[PDB]
Amino acid sequence: MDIDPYKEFGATVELLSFLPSDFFPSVRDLLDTAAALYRDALESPEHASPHHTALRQAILAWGDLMTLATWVGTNLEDPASRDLVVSYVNTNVGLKFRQLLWFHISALTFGRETVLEYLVSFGVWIRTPPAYRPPNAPILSTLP
Amino acid sequence: MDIDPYKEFGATVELLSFLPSDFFPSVRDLLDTAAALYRDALESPEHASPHHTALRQAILAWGDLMTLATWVGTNLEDPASRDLVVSYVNTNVGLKFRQLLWFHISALTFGRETVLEYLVSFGVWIRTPPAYRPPNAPILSTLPETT
Amino acid sequence: MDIDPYKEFGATVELLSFLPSDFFPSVRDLLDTAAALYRDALESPEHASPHHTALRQAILAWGDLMTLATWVGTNLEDPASRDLVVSYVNTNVGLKFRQLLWFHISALTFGRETVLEYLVSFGVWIRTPPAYRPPNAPILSTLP
Amino acid sequence: MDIDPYKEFGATVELLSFLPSDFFPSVRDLLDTAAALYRDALESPEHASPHHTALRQAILAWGDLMTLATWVGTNLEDPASRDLVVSYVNTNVGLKFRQLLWFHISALTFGRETVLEYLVSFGVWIRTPPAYRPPNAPILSTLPETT
Amino acid sequence: MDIDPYKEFGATVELLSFLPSDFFPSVRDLLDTAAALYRDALESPEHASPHHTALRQAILAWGDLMTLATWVGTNLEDPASRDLVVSYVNTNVGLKFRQLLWFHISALTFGRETVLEYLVSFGVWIRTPPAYRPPNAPILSTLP
Amino acid sequence: MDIDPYKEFGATVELLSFLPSDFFPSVRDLLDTAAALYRDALESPEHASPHHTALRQAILAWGDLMTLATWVGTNLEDPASRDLVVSYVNTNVGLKFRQLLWFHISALTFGRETVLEYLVSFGVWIRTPPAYRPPNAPILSTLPETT
Structure with missing residues (x-):
């Protein structure tokens, strides 16, 4: 029926559906x-x-x-x-x-909240047009 | 490899399985x-x-x-x-x-602990042949009231 | 030679031999x-x-x-x-x-004591004729 | 399955074979x-x-x-x-x-600890050259051994 | 037999086996x-x-x-x-x-814990597909 | 180049080596x-x-x-x-x-210090010819008890 395994972790499938x-x-x-x-x-x-x-x-x-x-x-x-x-x-x-x-995994690797960013952030990268957006895309980062 | 989605829920699959x-x-x-x-x-x-x-x-x-x-x-x-x-x-x-x-389901409905307890005891039930073990196998009893 | 395992816990070989x-x-x-x-x-x-x-x-x-x-x-x-x-x-x-x-094993979840009495009371059970013998053999029930 | 009937007293088989x-x-x-x-x-x-x-x-x-x-x-x-x-x-x-x-056997006679010990130290004895070791490996008895 | 020189330094060989x-x-x-x-x-x-x-x-x-x-x-x-x-x-x-x-070396150069990251982190880089992961891979860094 | 995996363990290889x-x-x-x-x-x-x-x-x-x-x-x-x-x-x-x-091995088993000590003294043993030095060369003695 209707249930998103991501929502409880405060998340949404679409956010993912829009990153093929x-x-x-x-x-x-x-x-x-x-x-x-x-x-x-x-x-x-x-x-x-x-x-x-x-x-x-x-x-x-x-x-x-x-x-x-x-x-x-x-x-x-x-x-x-x-x-x-x-x-x-x-x-x-x-x-x-x-x-x-x-x-x-990403969580334990990095962290719950922290994750969010890499999501939306990229969302910007992607959606943002070919000629500008530097191929140097977002990547799971550092500590501070 | 080898993992048991009950390791945390203080129990094991190998066990339950008997369960017809x-x-x-x-x-x-x-x-x-x-x-x-x-x-x-x-x-x-x-x-x-x-x-x-x-x-x-x-x-x-x-x-x-x-x-x-x-x-x-x-x-x-x-x-x-x-x-x-x-x-x-x-x-x-x-x-x-x-x-x-x-x-x-049973857990939330009856409380993690006691739940297995039922399961537990029952274990011997089946691990018990015919003519004996009353066909009145223990049942998921709505958590007994008080002391 | 001559030693019973069930002794370190007060019990005999015949005891269990009461449940062929x-x-x-x-x-x-x-x-x-x-x-x-x-x-x-x-x-x-x-x-x-x-x-x-x-x-x-x-x-x-x-x-x-x-x-x-x-x-x-x-x-x-x-x-x-x-x-x-x-x-x-x-x-x-x-x-x-x-x-x-x-x-x-049993006792390891029921308390050696009670455990004993199980086969005990039960003993008579089986040794107590069918048509009359209770409709339910006592069992290693969580206690109730 | 797998298990060492020696952990019951903080021990393992291996140690054994080491010995002849x-x-x-x-x-x-x-x-x-x-x-x-x-x-x-x-x-x-x-x-x-x-x-x-x-x-x-x-x-x-x-x-x-x-x-x-x-x-x-x-x-x-x-x-x-x-x-x-x-x-x-x-x-x-x-x-x-x-x-x-x-x-x-000997254990109960010479308390767990001491027991373990002896063999331990003894171990090297054998696994150690001739003119570089006592006339023979030490022996059991009670008060003599270490902690 | 079985012993990992990395484990004591709280590490694993595989982490390394998966970075050719x-x-x-x-x-x-x-x-x-x-x-x-x-x-x-x-x-x-x-x-x-x-x-x-x-x-x-x-x-x-x-x-x-x-x-x-x-x-x-x-x-x-x-x-x-x-x-x-x-x-x-x-x-x-x-x-x-x-x-x-x-x-x-990396340790003295940088530090024990700190290291971990460069490991896992890269792990992400690598595993992460060709077309996206910017060739600008992770490198032993700075101070804060 | 030139390094000694004992520099830290307060000793030297060149030394031990004599050791037949x-x-x-x-x-x-x-x-x-x-x-x-x-x-x-x-x-x-x-x-x-x-x-x-x-x-x-x-x-x-x-x-x-x-x-x-x-x-x-x-x-x-x-x-x-x-x-x-x-x-x-x-x-x-x-x-x-x-x-x-x-x-x-000896270290952990006998304590870094005293260990070499044995080694040390022994040094003169070998650095000592036949007819003298009793064939009863000092041995790894289970750390002497007390004072």
Whole structure:
């Protein structure tokens, strides 16, 4: 129905819909990265931040998902439709799950509020026309 | 790798699982009830308890899952394999959801602690064969009143 | 020689023998339970209450039994005795464990005391004829 | 699964192997030793030291083991095997045993701490050249060892 | 076996494995640089920071190593295998010893904690796609 | 250039070296013992004393060294030179390691100060010819008790 996993973290999907998927790196990179960065905490009895809790869902859902996606190519014998599904999956799926994936990470990496900026900010960069906006786009920053 | 979305919720999946599918109410039922219950606060931006959040993810998750389930029969035209997936889905998959799903609901509705407690004890129930264990398995008791 | 495990907690071998095998769920089911609740608490560097140790022992020997048992017939081509080993496995030995096994676990969540009285009152239960025997065998209920 | 029945007293297997398989006496020796020393105790409903348990446990275990070893060829007398396994057993199993088995024993006799110690320091002895070490490694006894 | 020289400095190898060797300049540059920057302190009776202590190990190990590597081309007469070993060495070896080398230096140059950033940060740069991420990558910075 | 990984540890290599190889226990032995001893705290992120750290480096170092030693015989196929390097390695090289290696271990196990002290005195031992110096060279004495 109607529910935005970003709103509770005080956010909006559109803000993201208007910074095309092409951006958010490939799940893997994201995965591997994030993973072995907090693995310990990740598998800890303390959901310090919602992000954490959430995270896994996307993980399972997906992990368990791909774990299934591959199955398709086992108990099924019809390469026409079998090798077709993988498409919509590893593509039109990673979408909502990639940016989001990253998105979340970004917090622990940097911070909730702080994040906002990189969002809107870029929003300006993008929308702002080709000839002016210096290709040197916004990037997840420093400390102060 | 290996992670348990209950590590924080002081419990484990490996455990619950015993649970014969015959236990968890129909997906929709679960969806309805759940939603139908806390509806407002749900779509609210206020993360009261993590449980809430994740749950929501499970939603979109299953959301697109079904939002995709309808996609299966839409673009794919191979009535043989088509129904072979919808099955595994609404079943071999929903399980994990329905399973955990419900549990969550139960939490807020009965309080994280005591909740598992029920689950716990019950454990031995099933881990108990026929002729004995009264067919009156313990039930989600509306939290007993006072002391 | 002559020593009873149930003694360090005041109990005899006959005691449990009042619930002829058939009751005690089988090994697997049992095991899981533990780790399924004390995963870490198990491999925890603390001996909170002996029990654990005991348990762990049964686990060892056992874990070694199942490591040797499976081995019996795979690394040594054997006759009318590669499927006849599993026979004794279950019946006269594993039993003692299953009970003692479960036995502990139980108390580890119900309080050794009450735990005892369970099989106790229950004893008469089973030993008290059917048509008359109460419509419900007392169980390791959270207490109520 | 995985677990070290030594953490129960802040210990790990490894340490063991470091030592020569031979090092530890054969069960028999070991067995009697205690049975003739602490028998009175053990049998009593006092868990004084967790050790007690594990100890006796290993005993049941092995007790069944040997009550099984003799059963290895009770009803059936297989030619090239029946005594080649009762061999392997003591070979790759009684090992894990005796080590701790004894360890345990002496321990209660020489308090946990001191116990650990001895072997520790002893360790290097062996893993240290000839004319650069005492006539032999130090010994057990009570008051002598460090903290 | 299993041990990470970076972990004690609160770090992880992977973080580094995912920023390919090609990055870390040639040992020499690194060496000469680092060397005559703290030489004094380097050969001082005070291991102020572990980095120091560690450092030399890699140094010796390597210094003493190359000191040997060259030997290969002395008491050995077989150019086929002699001139082959140098390969795996000056390449597949400098690896773990270069980034690490630098890595350590980086501290004294900048600082422990501070470092972290340049790591993760870049992690974002890299992973982040070609068309957007401005070639102007992260670089060891300033003071505040 | 010229550096001494002992400058900080208040000592020098040039010194120790006298030490006839016959002194340092086998590499493995050293590895085992060492590891086997402080195992946990070792793989721990907490730098207690620098000694620890460096030591670890020596590990990887030798680690890849051997991790490479196995590489030698794997890809290179010239049985003549092959064994000519493995030798220099496990010997002409291990030396420095075994040498220092052990020393470290000794430190934590006996305390930086007193440790060298032993080493020190010993110095004159070897620097002393036959017929005199009792073949009972001073030994790593478990730190004498009290005053």
